Write an enzyme that holds these catalytic residues in place. Structure first.
Site, short mmCIF file in Angstrom:
data_model
loop_
_atom_site.label_atom_id
_atom_site.label_comp_id
_atom_site.label_asym_id
_atom_site.label_seq_id
_atom_site.Cartn_x
_atom_site.Cartn_y
_atom_site.Cartn_z
N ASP A 132 2.63 2.87 -11.67
CA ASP A 132 2.94 2.05 -10.51
C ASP A 132 1.71 1.24 -10.11
O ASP A 132 0.65 1.81 -9.83
CB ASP A 132 3.35 2.93 -9.33
CG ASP A 132 3.75 2.17 -8.06
OD1 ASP A 132 3.28 2.47 -6.96
OD2 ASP A 132 4.56 1.27 -8.18
N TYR A 204 6.90 -1.98 6.18
CA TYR A 204 6.13 -1.41 7.26
C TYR A 204 4.83 -2.18 7.37
O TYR A 204 4.59 -3.10 6.59
CB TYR A 204 5.85 0.09 7.04
CG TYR A 204 5.45 0.55 5.64
CD1 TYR A 204 4.26 0.11 5.05
CD2 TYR A 204 6.31 1.42 4.94
CE1 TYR A 204 3.92 0.52 3.76
CE2 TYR A 204 5.97 1.83 3.66
CZ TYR A 204 4.77 1.39 3.07
OH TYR A 204 4.41 1.83 1.82
C1 LIG Z 1 -10.69 3.92 0.32
C2 LIG Z 1 -9.66 4.89 -0.18
O1 LIG Z 1 -9.24 4.80 -1.31
N1 LIG Z 1 -9.21 5.81 0.63
C3 LIG Z 1 -9.56 5.75 2.03
C4 LIG Z 1 -8.28 5.60 2.85
O2 LIG Z 1 -7.69 4.35 2.69
C5 LIG Z 1 -6.23 4.40 2.60
C6 LIG Z 1 -5.56 4.59 4.01
O3 LIG Z 1 -6.23 3.84 5.03
C7 LIG Z 1 -4.04 4.32 3.85
N2 LIG Z 1 -3.43 4.17 5.16
C8 LIG Z 1 -2.74 5.14 5.74
C9 LIG Z 1 -2.86 6.50 5.07
O4 LIG Z 1 -2.01 4.94 6.72
C10 LIG Z 1 -3.74 3.01 3.11
O5 LIG Z 1 -2.39 3.01 2.87
C11 LIG Z 1 -1.69 1.81 2.63
C12 LIG Z 1 -1.57 1.62 1.17
O6 LIG Z 1 -2.65 1.11 0.44
C13 LIG Z 1 -0.60 0.50 1.11
N3 LIG Z 1 -0.11 0.59 -0.23
C14 LIG Z 1 0.94 1.46 -0.15
N4 LIG Z 1 1.68 2.02 -1.13
C15 LIG Z 1 3.03 2.42 -0.93
C16 LIG Z 1 1.13 2.21 -2.43
O7 LIG Z 1 1.26 1.78 1.14
C17 LIG Z 1 0.49 0.97 2.05
C18 LIG Z 1 -0.24 1.86 3.07
C19 LIG Z 1 0.03 1.45 4.50
O8 LIG Z 1 -0.66 2.30 5.37
O9 LIG Z 1 -4.36 3.01 1.86
C20 LIG Z 1 -5.78 3.10 1.94
C21 LIG Z 1 -6.23 2.81 0.50
O10 LIG Z 1 -5.66 1.57 -0.01
O11 LIG Z 1 -8.54 5.84 4.23
C22 LIG Z 1 -8.97 7.21 4.39
C23 LIG Z 1 -8.76 7.58 5.88
O12 LIG Z 1 -7.40 7.37 6.29
C24 LIG Z 1 -10.33 7.37 3.72
O13 LIG Z 1 -10.66 8.75 3.76
C25 LIG Z 1 -10.31 7.02 2.23
O14 LIG Z 1 -9.78 8.08 1.47
#
Ligand SMILES: CC(=O)N[C@H]1[C@H](O[C@H]2[C@@H](O)[C@@H](NC(C)=O)[C@H](O[C@H]3[C@H](O)[C@H]4N=C(N(C)C)O[C@H]4[C@@H]3CO)O[C@@H]2CO)O[C@H](CO)[C@@H](O)[C@H]1O
Length: 392
Positions: A132, A204
């Site tokens: 994916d 979302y």
């Molecule tokens: C930098 C890293 O890889 N990890 C970070 C982490 O980043 C996350 C979160 O902030 C996610 N947000 C959340 C959990 O609400 C964020 O999620 C995104 C995601 O990228 C988008 N893509 C999708 N998919 C279905 C694949 O969904 C959306 C969501 C919408 O929220 O993704 C990032 C990485 O892209 O942040 C944490 C702390 O929360 C940090 O520890 C570190 O691990």
């Protein structure tokens, strides 16, 4: 075929969230997608956290033991798969955070070839049913064509491996996609569709810190009464993909298991300043922490949207309740869509309050979920325990 029930298991949940693959109600899903994998300039796809991913020893892992072996959440997901044979797993590559580094490999044949090959290598070594991509977002016309070609690279890659193993299974290729018009209108959706098993529409993050008025962050329908409360809507995206030529049954409707907050607000559609705290980051709360003390929950079924609001602290948190998740299930069935997708597995409640539970039941229960048996045989795996289908 029946509906899909897709959840993302996020690499990092094994830390502060305490969520491990073992505690996934696997009978509730058909697809666990493990996020995220990163990409190198070369096109090389690689694992974000080999501790979480491959090395950590869970209960049950001999430290010692013969062989070159995989552990981490990859062994745990494979064990989830051995036990739940309708549960497929996909490696998910990209994410908001790593999508700056998709454009450079994607522009060249070498880069895409290298992406395709490393992704297949990883899939077939770690026991995945497919891959994916989550490129947020191809920002121009070129990047969009590049995305079709990249997709093509990966489809050709996975298929070549299946050709090499005809008694085994065919493999999956999906993408996490944009519900915002300004992004999906750049995409060559129908050409892309040719390569994909299904689409996980991120319906979302429609409202959050970036805005000036508190809105609904994952609502299904536009508020005619209060336009300012609904800047986007699932419905616009889905019927726009369908006019573009994606089969609806291939569109899996993304639903959040977290909620986005607004501070110093009178309510939905009014201005806010600040977003407050969160369960793990600011302005973002896990659904299982909802509802917060002293907030009244409003459910607007007609547009399928809900929120909590605390009149004293003037704080609004847009998130779905079970009633709303039910209305979302309703839209999925009614419109003959591919099923439901959730980001992300740790923030959900259990039992009668599981949002996912709620959607699977409004889908007609598990009996209506897509029956596609997963792949347990990875003959070319570089890991012996995985190659041998993990004995003790
Ligand atoms: C930098 C890293 O890889 N990890 C970070 C982490 O980043 C996350 C979160 O902030 C996610 N947000 C959340 C959990 O609400 C964020 O999620 C995104 C995601 O990228 C988008 N893509 C999708 N998919 C279905 C694949 O969904 C959306 C969501 C919408 O929220 O993704 C990032 C990485 O892209 O942040 C944490 C702390 O929360 C940090 O520890 C570190 O691990």
């Amino acid at each position: 075929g029946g509906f899909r029930s897709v959840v993302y298991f996020v690499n990092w949940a094994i830390y502060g969230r305490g969520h491990n693959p073992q505690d996934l109600k696997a009978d509730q899903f058909t697809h666990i997608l493990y996020a995220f994998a990163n990409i190198r300039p070369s096109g090389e796809v690689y694992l974000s956290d080999t501790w979480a991913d491959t090395d950590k020893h869970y209960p049950g892992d001999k430290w010692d033991e013969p062989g070159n072996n995989v552990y981490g959440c990859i062994k745990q997901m494979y064990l989830l798969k051995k036990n739940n044979r309708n549960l497929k797993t996909l490696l998910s590559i990209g994410g908001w955070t790593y999508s700056p580094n998709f454009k450079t490999p994607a522009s060249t044949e070498e880069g895409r070839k290298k992406f395709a090959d490393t992704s297949l290598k990883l899939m077939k070594d770690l026991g995945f049913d497919g891959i994916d991509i989550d490129w947020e977002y191809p920002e121009d016309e070129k990047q969009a064509n590049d995305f079709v070609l990249l997709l093509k690279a990966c489809r050709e890659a996975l298929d070549a491996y299946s050709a090499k193993h005809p008694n085994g299974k065919k493999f999956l290729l999906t993408i996490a996609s944009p519900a915002g018009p300004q992004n999906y209108n750049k995409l060559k959706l129908a050409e892309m569709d040719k390569y994909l098993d299904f689409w996980n529409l991120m319906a979302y993050d429609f409202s959050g810190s970036w805005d000036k008025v508190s809105g609904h962050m994952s609502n299904v329908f536009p508020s005619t009464t209060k336009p300012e409360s609904t800047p986007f809507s699932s419905d616009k995206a889905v019927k726009d993909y369908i006019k573009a030529g994606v089969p609806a049954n291939k569109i899996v409707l993304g639903m959040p298991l977290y909620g986005r907050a607004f501070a110093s607000t009178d309510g939905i559609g009014t201005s806010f300043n600040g977003v407050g705290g969160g369960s793990w980051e600011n302005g973002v709360w896990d659904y299982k922490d909802m509802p917060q003390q002293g907030a009244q929950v409003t459910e607007l079924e007609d547009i399928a949207a809900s929120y909590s609001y605390d009149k004293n602290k003037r704080y609004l948190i847009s998130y779905d309740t079970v009633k709303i998740a039910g209305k979302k299930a309703e839209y999925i069935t009614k419109n003959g869509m591919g099923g439901g997708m959730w980001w992300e597995s740790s923030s959900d409640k259990t039992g009668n309050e599981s949002l996912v539970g709620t959607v699977v039941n409004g889908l007609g229960g598990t009996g209506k979920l897509e029956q596609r048996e997963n792949e347990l045989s990875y003959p070319e795996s570089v890991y012996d325990n995985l190659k041998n289908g993990m004995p003790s």
